[PDB]
Amino acid sequence: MAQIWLWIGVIGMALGSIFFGIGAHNAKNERWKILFTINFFICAIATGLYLSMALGQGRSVIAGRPTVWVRYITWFLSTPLLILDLTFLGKTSLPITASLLGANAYMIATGFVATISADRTIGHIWYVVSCFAFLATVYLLVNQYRKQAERNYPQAKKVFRKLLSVHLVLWTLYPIVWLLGNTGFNAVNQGTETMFYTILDITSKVGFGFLSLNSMHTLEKNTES
Amino acid sequence: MAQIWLWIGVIGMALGSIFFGIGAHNAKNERWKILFTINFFICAIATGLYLSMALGQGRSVIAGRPTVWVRYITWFLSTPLLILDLTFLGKTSLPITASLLGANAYMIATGFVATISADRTIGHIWYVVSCFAFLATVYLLVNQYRKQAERNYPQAKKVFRKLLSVHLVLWTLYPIVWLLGNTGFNAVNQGTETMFYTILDITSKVGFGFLSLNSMHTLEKNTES
Amino acid sequence: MAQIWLWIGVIGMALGSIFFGIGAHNAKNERWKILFTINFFICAIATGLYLSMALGQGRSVIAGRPTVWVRYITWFLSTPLLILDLTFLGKTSLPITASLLGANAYMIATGFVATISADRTIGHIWYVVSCFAFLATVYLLVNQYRKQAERNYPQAKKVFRKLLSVHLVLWTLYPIVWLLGNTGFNAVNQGTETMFYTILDITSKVGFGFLSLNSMHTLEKNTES
Ligand SMILES: CCCCCCCC/C=C/CCCCCCCC(=O)O
Ligand SMILES: CCCCCCCC/C=C/CCCCCCCC(=O)O
Ligand SMILES: CCCCCCCC/C=C/CCCCCCCC(=O)O
Ligand SMILES: [Cl-]
Ligand SMILES: [Cl-]
Ligand SMILES: [Cl-]
């Protein structure tokens, strides 16, 4: 079950990479070129993640607990680009963009520590820290990010409402999966945990990528001269 | 002794993070927002460092020598922000900012190698290299950085004199502690070495952070219309 | 044989660092200062690489195969600067610069995985992936990069022809050496592989550095008022 879902991730991320790469190659306009390029690299990074996992790499047995550490390495590179999708579309200011990238980096890094710690009490402390770094981004996203975006696109508040809702709901599922997997309560087996992360990853990367493109189209139409 | 000082670092860095974060949240002005945000992340990074150390992580016994490697990982992230404090305040040019960030990165990286090398003769070679990377920053700071800053703020040369004096004196103490600890002569025990680094870290992060804010206030007053 | 070539690299990279550093110190003009600074750090990074290797560091015996992993760590830092040499000189746009830096980062990262994988079939898969990341840069370099550069310097198309030819020919030799060494067919001994990488590194760093400076001189003369 685990193995098939890892190859599904390889396929899904590769297809995402191809179609965003084609879009980047054909883009009319530097802003479109940038947006396609961000999403291409999100999916290209993840294709490499899923290939490494599918080939059996990136995994260690830590004190008897099988632990996939490689996803934190690539997440640390792809999740800032997903943030960049948001801050590019919302024309976010530099301090708020940096704060979002910093808080997100903090989240992934402490999530990594929460995962690889042999002492699972210590790991669960870092999980809480990581959750508070995530909540920091939530605060930034629904306050400063949203207000700037709505100020920049007064006629497109719904566009950013949908971007934020999809981002927040989907990303909140990750710490839930983490608590369900062998990092926490071990309420689901490894094959189910792998399926969950794979579906989340494809949705949060390929799915959000296409939403960001659709969002861009609406923003440009709303701001046609 | 070591354990208490690690928790003192957690507390001190957390308090620094809180007060810089409050300042960032209330800031009047993008330049103030940026400066508070830089210092928030300096202290937030260090809070995580000190929590990891306080919980017993980030340490290895290398050929019988207890070695705290995690501080080099976080220093590599926080020390460039301390440089950014300086180059933001001094409106430093791009090549000099990059040179400062590069030389500082070189210093921390070779300091890491100087620390983890089992062969302590090799480690001491890297210590010398790291010292010369530090001296490179000294040269850049008291020459190009200072002249640009004084050119940008002709009425505030004292402000940059104090920033540089505090930076240079405090940062020079780090290679001294390193020579005193079990990385060099082992003239002080681990508990004293830990206290020294903790006091240095709190002063160079929380202390320098507040100095940078005071400096900003003086710079803006000197350049009030 | 291996040991002498590692020290030759230390010497050659150190000399490159010194002369680019002198050029940076004397530069007339921010653009010249930037270009000298990029090449200084390329060579300074590599000096540290070659010192670590010369001192016997950065090498592991992986399942019986001596494997120099440290070169991928420093290549990951120096090769983007060589790209920056190109994109600085060609005034490349942001999406194409990012795409070049991203594809190059992908190449080095999968090259690292191709090298350290104990399962050499898996390693050879990553070698192919890394080759396709390199071919991605080739496509970007001879298409978008070149057209932008020729548009920016219509009277200096030969300058970018020489830059690209030297970059492409020299960098293509690296995957050939990799196939010849114990990472692939093991057709040359370690001492010869080390000599090959050392000569390639000195040429692609010190040599390309001086070519980039000569290129800059021609570009500025062609665009003298
Ligand atoms: C791989 C992605 C890593 C993301 C790291 C994010 C770091 C966040 C830290 C923010 C502090 C800096 C805030 C902005 C500084 C601007 C500097 C300047 O204007 O001179
Ligand atoms: C985590 C912090 C890491 C800091 C790394 C610093 C790297 C220093 C290297 C400098 C070389 C580049 C100099 C400026 C390049 C400008 C490029 C351009 O203008 O196109
Ligand atoms: C150490 C060097 C590492 C190089 C990493 C290169 C990353 C390449 C990824 C590209 C995606 C981003 C494309 C440009 C984003 C611009 C963002 C913006 O304008 O807000
Ligand atoms: Cl990923
Ligand atoms: Cl730190
Ligand atoms: Cl290198």
Å from CA of A62 to ligand 5 middle = 27
Rounding to the nearest 10 degrees, give the CA dihedral for residues A101, A103, A109, A111: -130
d(CA B63, CA B182): 12
Picking from B37, B45, B56, the nearest residue to A99 by CB comes out as B37
Instruction: Give A121: exposed, middle or buried? Use CB within 10 Å, 0-12, 13-18, 19+.
Output: exposed
Give the position of tokens 């059996």: A56
- Neighbour-count burial for C53-69, b at 16+ CB within 10 Å, e otherwise: bbbebbeeeeeeeebbe
Query: Cα angle vertex A209, ends A89, A101, to 5°?
Result: 55
In this structure, what token pair is assigned to residue A216? 């861009």
The CA distance from A152 to the nearest CA of chain B, in Å, is 17
Separation CA B107–CA B52 (nearest Å) = 23
Among C33, C40, C84, C88, most B C-beta atoms within 10 A, so best to mutate, is C33
- Pick the closest to residue B148 from B212, B103, B91 (CA basis): B91
CA-to-CA distance for C163 and C161, rounded, in angstroms?
A: 6
Kindly report the CA angle at C202 between C196 and C208, in degrees rounded to 5? Answer: 125
- In this complex, which of B33, B45, B57 lies closest to A95 when CB atoms are compared? B33
Ligand 2 nearest atom to the CA of residue B80, by list position: 2
Contacts of C155 (CB under 8 A, 6+ apart): C222, C223
Is any atom of ligand 3 closer than 6 Å to the C-beta of A170?
no
In one-letter notation, the amino acid at residue B150 is: E
What is the B41 CA–ligand 6 centroid distance (Å)? Answer: 30
Instruction: Dig out the tokens for A184 from the structure.
Output: 């926490």
Q: Do A57 and C102 touch (CB under 8 A)?
A: no
Experimental method: X-ray
Q: B67 — phi, psi (to 5°)? A: -135, 120
DSSP state of A93: -
C-alpha–C-alpha distance, residues C39 and C124, integer Å: 32
Report the alpha-carbon distance of residue B83 to residue B77 in Å, rounded: 11
3-state secondary structure of A58: coil
> Which of B76, B101, B112, B137 for mutating ligand 2's site (highest number of atoms within 8 Å of CB)?
B101
- Distance separating alpha carbons of residues A138 and A130, to the nearest angstrom: 12
The total of other beta-carbon atoms located within 10 Å of residue C209's CB is: 25
SS3 content of chain A, % helix, strand, coil (to 5): 80, 5, 15
* Ligand number with the minimum distance to the CA of C77: 3
* Shortest-distance atom of ligand 3 to CA C102: 8
Chain-centre distance for alpha carbon C18: 19
CB atoms < 10 A from the CB of A134, how many?
A: 22
The residue count of chain C comes to 225
Amino acid identity at C4: I
Reduced to 3 states (helix: H, G, I; strand: E, B; else coil), residue A28 is: coil
Domains of chain A by start residue, with CATH: 2-222 (1.20.1070.10)
Interface residues of chain A, partner chain B, Cβ below 8 Å: 93-95, 98-99, 102, 106, 109-110, 113, 117, 119, 122, 125, 129
Q: CA-to-CA distance for C217 and A210, rounded, in angstroms?
A: 45
Reference B194, options B204, B184, B206, B182; nearest CA is B182
Q: Which ligand is nearest to the CA of B37?
A: 1
Residue with the nearest Cα to atom 16 of ligand 2? C34
The C-alpha atoms of residue A187 and residue A176 are separated, in whole angstroms, by 11
Distance separating alpha carbons of residues C195 and C189, to the nearest angstrom: 10
Strand pairing of B59-62 and A59-62?
A: unpaired
SS3 A65: strand
CB neighbours of residue A133 within 10 Å: 21
Element (H, E) at B59: strand B59-62
Could you tell me if B97 and B87 are in contact, meaning their C-beta atoms sit under 8 angstroms apart? yes
- Please report which residue ranges of A156-223 form alpha helices under DSSP H: 157-180, 190-202, 208-222
- Token look-up 């001994």 returns C189
- The answer to whether the beta carbons of residues C112 and C69 sit under 8 Å apart is yes
Contacts of C109 in chain A (CB under 8 A): 48
**B41 with A109: CB under 8 angstroms?**
no
Apex CA C188: angle with CA C184 and CA C189, to 5°? 105
What resolution, expressed in A, was reported for this entry? 1.7
CA gap B52, A126 in Å, rounded: 9
Q: How many CB atoms lie within 10 A of CB B188?
A: 15
What is the position in ligand 1's atom list of the atom closest to the CA of B38? 11
Breaks following residues of chain C (C-to-N distance > 2.5 Å): none
Give kind and range of the element (H or E) at residue A62: strand A59-62
Residues C3 and C54 sit within 8 Å (Cβ to Cβ): yes
Q: How far apart are CA A203 and CA B73, in angstroms?
A: 32
> Is the distance from CB of A140 to CB of A164 less than 8 angstroms?
no
What DSSP assignment string belongs to chain C? Answer: -HHHHHHHHHHHHHHHHHHHHHHHHH-SSHHHHHHHHHHHHHHHHHHHHHHHHHTT-SEEEETTEEEE-HHHHHHHHHHHHHHHHHHHHHT--HHHHHHHHHHHHHHHHHHHHHHH-SSHHHHHHHHHHHHHHHHHHHHHIIIIIHHHHHHH-TT-HHHHHHHHHHHHHHHHHHHHHHHHSTTTT--S-HHHHHHHHHHHHHIIIIIHHHHHHHHHHHHHHHT--
For residue C72, report the distance from its CA to the centre of ligand 6, in Å: 8
* Residue whose token pair is 């290797």: C53
**Subunits with 3+ C-beta pairs closer than 8 A to B:** A, C
Contact A41, A167 (CB under 8 A): no
Q: How far apart are CA B141 and CA B76, in angstroms?
A: 19
What phi and psi values does residue C183 have, to the nearest 5 degrees?
-75, -20
Q: Which residues of B touch C (CB under 8 A)?
A: 93-95, 98-99, 102, 106, 109-110, 113, 117, 119, 122, 125, 129
A31 to chain C: closest CA residue: C95
Give B44's contacts in chain A (Cβ within 8 Å): 102, 106
Going by the DSSP 8-state scheme, the letter that residue B119 receives in this structure is S
Work out whether strand B59-62 and strand A65-68 pair parallel, antiparallel, or are unpaired: unpaired
**Lookup result for tokens 């297809």:** A15
- Cα separation, C206 vs C216, in Å, equals 15
